[PDB]
DNA sequence: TCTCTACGGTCATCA
DNA sequence: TCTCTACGGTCATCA
């Protein structure tokens, strides 16, 4: 009977992280580690990791969870990604947390100047 | 039988202009009047009239003719539009031939000022 | 917890 | 008679 990979104790996994993101991880351990397991909207991914629509729209590249748009159900569906997947890609894209910090610095100086 | 609308003589219409563009016009008159009947690629429409993909991709807004891409058949299909349709829209978009000329002037001073 | 495309302008590859 | 979207940024809509 397989144990949550963080706590090594629990056997009931979080249904979304298990089912959608293929992570053997319990709900509690997920709350106790947002550095890995927090879900981000598509807008957060663009803003916080400078990903783009081509990347995030790629189903072979990220798992995602769709929900109704909380602003109005007649709006485009919300999409949530799991931080570790995202943050792995961003780092590979930009060269670790350092390289990403630089990109953040770069676009920052861009708009100050504009 | 219905006669061409340019010459009023011929009864055989140009098959593409008739069939695709819904114009009762014959091959000869289409050659004698490119100001209306010449076909333009999608790239020509963008360059010469500052139309955009959303506009040109709209089937309700323009008729179009698709052919194999003459550069390579594995490339995206060529699309051709008829000048009068295009030039009507551009004029409505930019405010006659005058307003379009200005837009042409506008983007050209843009490129100069990008040294 | 929001999202998508529209707008400049353009090189590349199918490219 | 070449076409597409990829990139930087951002606002309006549904929007
Ligand atoms: Zn656990
Ligand atoms: Zn005729």
What does it look like?
The structure holds 2 chains of a larger assembly. Chain A is 49% helix and 10% strand. Chain A is built from 7 helices and 3 strands. In chain A, helix 6 crosses helix 7. Chain A is globular. The chains hardly touch. The complex binds zinc ion (ZN) (2 copies). One zinc ion binds next to helix 2 of chain A. Chain A binds a DNA duplex (15 and 15 nucleotides) through strand 1, helix 4, strand 3 and helix 7. Chain B: Belongs to the XPA family.
Bound molecules: zinc ion
Oligomer: 2 chains of a larger assembly
SS summary, helix count of chain A: 7
State Rg of chain A. 16 Å
- Major sheet strand order of chain A: 1-3-2
**Secondary-structure element series of chain A:** HHHEHHEEHH
% residues in beta strands of chain A: 5-15%
For the sheet with most strands of chain A, the description reads:
3 strands, antiparallel
**Distance between the amino and carboxyl termini of chain A:** 58 Å
Organism (chain B): Saccharomyces cerevisiae (strain ATCC 204508 / S288c) (Baker's yeast)
Family (chain B): Belongs to the XPA family.
Subcellular location (chain B): Nucleus
Function (chain B): Involved in nucleotide excision repair. Binds specifically to damaged DNA. Required for the incision step.
């Amino acid at each position: 009977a397989p144990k949550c990979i963080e706590c090594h104790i629990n056997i009931e996994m979080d249904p979304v992280l298990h089912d959608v993101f293929k992570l053997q991880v319990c709900k509690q351990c997920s709350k106790e580690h947002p550095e890995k397991y927090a879900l981000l909207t598509k807008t957060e991914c663009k803003e916080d990791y400078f990903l783009t629509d081509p990347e995030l729209n790629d189903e072979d590249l990220f798992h995602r969870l769709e929900k109704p748009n909380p602003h109005s159900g007649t709006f485009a569906r919300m999409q949530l990604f799991v931080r570790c997947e995202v943050e792995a890609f961003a780092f590979k894209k930009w060269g670790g947390e350092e390289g990403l910090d630089e990109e953040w610095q770069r676009r920052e100086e861009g708009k100050a100047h504009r």
